[PDB]
Ligand binder design. Structure first.
Ligand SMILES: Nc1ncnc2c1ncn2[C@@H]1O[C@H](COP(=O)(O)OP(=O)(O)OP(=O)(O)O)[C@@H](O)[C@H]1O
Ligand SMILES: Nc1ncnc2c1ncn2[C@@H]1O[C@H](COP(=O)(O)OP(=O)(O)OP(=O)(O)O)[C@@H](O)[C@H]1O
Ligand SMILES: CC(C)C[C@H](N)CO
Ligand SMILES: [Mg+2]
Ligand SMILES: [Zn+2]
Length: 848
């Protein structure tokens, strides 16, 4: 064995050993328990950074742990390759997005290999390849004919100067980011997934996820935004029907989640596009201007929560169906047309938005809810005003005294009796628009025939192959300018027709890739039945909380869709979820910290990202210190959920520990060579060696619990460090001493193998001749945890009367019980009770 730690030499050697043994190339092995550990696959932007290293090292720690415990572990890697970063680099370097993508994959795959993750590279997928995306095209056509996917007009942001559709993130103050031109709102046909049809399933199945973080489930529930409310119709007053037709002439319909406060409604509000708004503004210019200012804005909830709530009265009136009050209709900029009925009632006394609105315009505020003896003040808002749990109704006639649900059900029956309303469940969830007017993306498998309409491409003709010899300019999708792509024949009638030129939302690729990994070479479906039956669901998922809403929702949606098609038989894709904390680093601009000395503007610390160029290139870290030093630093610096600060100090400390680990095994082997590890009964071992074995097996239990249950890797390393500390303070030079040292070192290297497998694989082979993965995860020797028993003297009134042998973990009650049961004590007690039993643990028990 070489004396000094040489990561640059041993890490490639260890990787070749693992590759030649095919330890990570797994099949559907019914002879082993499966374990599917998945890390969120990355965008091939060019090169990874320490954040990506942290993510994938975490996934590899869990994978290797389960591997050592005999699981058949699948840990697949792949590339989320479609998207805008390629197009922007395409128009910047004048290269095809595909070519820029595949070269990025090349460099990043070698970066990944050099870190030594235990990854089945035979299951690698790249989502921009037709062999992958043909199956989401397949699923699209299947759902399209069932109407789960449908086509309808929707609104987009059109830039008249760049001639491109832009997202809400590229429009700033109503203008394009790279043009500064006023953005038009165009209605264009687009394709949607009817995810609202699955809202109840998507919400309720969250309760199955007993091993998900509660905040992630909470975020899913709020995004879906289910409410149980009341449709309530207000009959239009006789003097306010001018210009209204249809149902709008006879009633105004609203949705509310607080029908228990319908008796406290003081005004009503409609959206600017509401027919009441249009009819009342036909002769009032001020209302036209307010309607125009309303449509001149985005319905973005981000902009609306800070938006100044404004409104104008209309002079029209409707009638509350419960108490007969005539209520004035207002046009309000907070009422959104297309959500519910486009109209709402207002109860300022119990809704904070309605309170501030009615405070600005001095509208009535009528209390209908009381929470105990709390005083109601119509000129201040308290939190208990909107209390839905501890309130009872007042000023409500029949309904006085009821709680929320009792008044709800009571109002429900009354409205249905008068035909003036009924209960209704609504959801904030909108359908999933998947059309993108971009080139680098999955083509939508639709053909437009002037006779047949929107026709899906037959399965035999899939994939619709995206042409890769394209260099986008940015003035519109190149597909719409390539007749050799869009000109085709109609698959229904054979006539001249045009392919759809929009491509799919790139979230679609990441909504099912975890299944494609189960059989990534299957050419008869999305995923083979046999492989789906074997791998079931993802056992462990690891990725940042930035993707905890849409991605997860979409992946869960697709899972149910694929299940309903008979492709899989699980309800939920991911059983456990781990959200790693972000890695941060001090920033510099005028720039990478490696191209900087310790002039440019030195600033503070923030997340590692290509935006500020604050990302430490791991390849420079590996060339400098080694893969194991990189992995150890990440796992040791902080709990995986906590944020991780880059530190040259932390890198050096980790490297010194690997040198210490190497030196420890080398100095042990040079003093006598390898021996059989201690095993069996430890009676006869010295106190110091019994204590070391206690430290050893206590450490094994602690690291096993930290990997498997708590998923805290920094404390697991600290526990092995303490074991080594006690090892260093123990005389292990005797025959029994060497045997225990062998046992300690054989366990330490296996306990650390998931975190630093290169050095541990090498050290193990110097200690033991068996395959490390065959030797398995270290077992706990429970006998090594039992400490010796103590002899306690029993005294009756201070006189020595007997002796008891107690455990080293006996309580004060066990010492009292054993002392009262001793024969010498029971004889000197003369049947008389004890006023006190003074107990000195380990010394004496005095019975008085
Ligand atoms: N289209 C709409 N635009 C704006 N506000 C609306 C609209 N429809 C209903 N509202 C108002 O929003 C209230 C609550 O609806 P929301 O979707 O916010 O449910 P919620 O947050 O679960 O309810 P709660 O605030 O009672 O807990 C309704 O009582 C009504 O006053
Ligand atoms: N600084 C970081 N620290 C920790 N994990 C990170 C960091 N940056 C990315 N990751 C994680 O690595 C995986 C891939 O990240 P990727 O950079 O591809 O996407 P992203 O987070 O959307 O990008 P961006 O950093 O530009 O916001 C995800 O699980 C993500 O949470
Ligand atoms: C699961 C996916 C949404 C993850 C992206 N490819 C990278 O952040
Ligand atoms: Mg269960
Ligand atoms: Zn046709």
């Amino acid at each position: 064995m070489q004396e000094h730690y040489q990561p640059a030499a041993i890490e490639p050697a260890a990787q070749k050993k693992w590759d030649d043994a095919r330890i990570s190339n797994v099949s559907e092995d019914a002879s082993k328990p499966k374990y599917y550990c998945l890390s969120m696959f990355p965008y091939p932007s060019g090169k990874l950074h320490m954040g990506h290293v942290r993510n994938y090292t975490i996934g590899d720690v869990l994978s290797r742990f389960k591997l050592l415990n005999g699981f058949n572990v699948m840990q697949p890697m792949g590339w989320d390759a479609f998207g805008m970063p390629a197009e922007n680099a395409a128009m910047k370097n004048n290269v095809a997005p595909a070519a820029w993508t595949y070269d990025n994959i090349e460099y990043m795959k070698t970066q990944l290999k050099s870190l030594g993750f235990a990854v089945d590279w035979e299951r690698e997928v790249a989502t921009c390849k037709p062999e992958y995306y043909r199956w989401e095209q397949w699923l699209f056509t299947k759902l399209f004919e069932k109407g789960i996917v449908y086509r309808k007009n929707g609104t987009v942001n059109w830039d008249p100067v760049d001639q491109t559709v832009l997202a809400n993130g590229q429009v700033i103050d109503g203008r394009g980011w790279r043009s500064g031109a006023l953005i038009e709102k165009r209605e264009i046909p687009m394709y949607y997934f009817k995810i609202t049809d699955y809202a109840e399933e998507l919400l309720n199945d969250l309760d199955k996820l007993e091993h998900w973080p509660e905040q992630v489930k909470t975020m899913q529930r709020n995004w879906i935004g289910k409410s149980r409310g009341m449709t309530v119709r207000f009959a239009v007053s006789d003097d306010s029907k001018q210009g209204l037709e249809g149902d709008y002439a006879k009633f105004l319909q609203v949705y509310t989640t607080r029908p228990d406060t319908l008796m406290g409604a003081t005004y009503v509000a409609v959206a600017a596009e509401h027919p009441l708004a249009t009819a009342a503004a036909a002769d009032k210019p001020e209302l036209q201007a307010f309607i125009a200012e309303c449509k001149a804005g985005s319905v973005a909830e981000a902009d609306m929560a800070t938006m100044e709530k404004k409104g104008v009265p209309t002079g029209r009136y409707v009638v509350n169906p419960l108490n007969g009050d005539k209520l004035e209709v207002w046009i309000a900029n907070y009422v959104l047309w297309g959500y519910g009925d486009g109209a709402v009632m207002a109860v300022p006394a119990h809704d904070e938005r309605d309170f501030e609105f009615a405070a600005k315009y001095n509208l009535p505020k009528k209390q209908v809810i009381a929470v105990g003896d709390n005083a109601f003040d119509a000129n201040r808002w308290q939190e208990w005003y909107g209390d839905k749990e501890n309130g009872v109704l007042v000023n409500s006639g029949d309904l006085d005294g009821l709680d929320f649900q009792t008044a709800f059900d009571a109002v429900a029956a009354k409205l249905q009796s008068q035909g003036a309303g009924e209960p209704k469940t609504q959801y904030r969830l909108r359908d999933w628009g998947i059309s993108r007017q971009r080139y680098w993306g999955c083509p939508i498998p639709i053909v437009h025939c002037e006779k047949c309409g929107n026709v899906p491409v037959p399965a035999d003709q899939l994939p619709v192959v995206l042409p890769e010899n394209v260099v986008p300019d940015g003035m519109g999708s190149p597909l719409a300018k390539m007749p050799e792509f869009y000109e085709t024949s109609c698959p229904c009638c054979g006539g001249a027709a045009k392919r759809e030129t929009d491509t799919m939302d790139t979230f679609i690729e990441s909504s099912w890739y975890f299944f494609r990994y189960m059989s990534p070479k299957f050419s008869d479906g999305m995923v083979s039945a046999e492989s789906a039956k074997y791998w079931g669901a993802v056992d462990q998922y690891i990725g940042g909380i930035e993707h905890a809403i849409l991605h997860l929702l979409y992946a869960r949606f697709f899972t149910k869709l694929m299940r309903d098609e008979g492709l899989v038989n699980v309800d939920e894709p991911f059983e456990r979820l781990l959200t790693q904390g972000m890695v941060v680093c001090e920033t510099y601009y005028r720039i990478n910290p490696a191209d900087v000395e310790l002039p440019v503007v030195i600033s503070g610390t923030e997340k590692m990202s290509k935006s500020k160029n604050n990302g430490v290139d791991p390849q420079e870290l590996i060339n400098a210190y080694g893969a194991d030093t990189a992995r150890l630093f990440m796992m040791f610096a902080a709990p995986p959920e906590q944020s991780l600060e880059w530190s040259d100090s932390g890198v050096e400390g980790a490297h010194r520990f690997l040198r210490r680990l190497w030196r420890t095994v080398y100095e042990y082997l040079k003093q006598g060579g390898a021996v059989k590890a201690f095993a069996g009964n430890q009676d006869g071992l010295s106190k110091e060696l019994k204590d070391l074995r206690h430290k050893l097996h206590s450490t094994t239990a602690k690291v096993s619990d930290d990997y498997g249950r708590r998923q805290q890797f920094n404390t697991a390393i600290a526990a092995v460090m303490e074991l080594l500390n006690q090892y260093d303070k123990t005389d292990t030079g005797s025959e029994q001493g060497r045997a225990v040292a062998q046992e300690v070192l054989e366990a330490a290297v296996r306990l650390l193998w998931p975190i630093v497998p290169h050095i541990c694989e090498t050290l193990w082979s110097e200690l033991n001749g068996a395959k490390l993965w065959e030797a398995g995860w270290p077992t706990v020797d429970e006998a090594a945890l039992v400490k010796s028993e103590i002899e306690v003297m029993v005294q009756v009134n201070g006189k020595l009367r007997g002796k008891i042998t107690v455990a080293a973990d006996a309580s004060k009650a066990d010492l009292e019980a054993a002392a009262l049961a001793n024969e010498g004590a029971v004889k000197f007690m003369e049947g008389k009770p004890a006023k006190k039993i003074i107990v000195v643990p380990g010394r004496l028990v005095n019975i008085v």
